[PDB]
Amino acid sequence: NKIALLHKEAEEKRAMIEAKRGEDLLKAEELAAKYRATGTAPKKILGIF
C-alpha cells in the first residue's frame, strides 16, 4: 500500500537523516578526537568554540 510505501519513504528519509546523524555523531567523534588532541585554540572546551 502506497501510504505504507510513503511511510517507508519518510522512514528512509529518517534513515537518511540518521545517516547524516550517524556521521554527524562521527564528526563529533572526530571532534572528540581533535578536541582531545587539541593542537588548537579553546576548540575543545565545554562544547566547541
From Swiss-Prot:
Belongs to the remorin family. This is Remorin. Signal peptide: none annotated. One of its GO terms (biological process) is cell-cell signaling. GO terms for molecular function: galacturonate binding. The N-terminus is blocked. Phosphorylated. The chain holds residues 150 to 198 of 198 of the full protein. Keywords: Cell membrane, Coiled coil, Membrane, Phosphoprotein, Transport. It comes from Solanum tuberosum. It is found in: Cell membrane. GO terms for cellular component: plasma membrane. Binds to both simple and complex galacturonides. May be involved in cell-to-cell signaling and molecular transport. It comes from the Eukaryota.
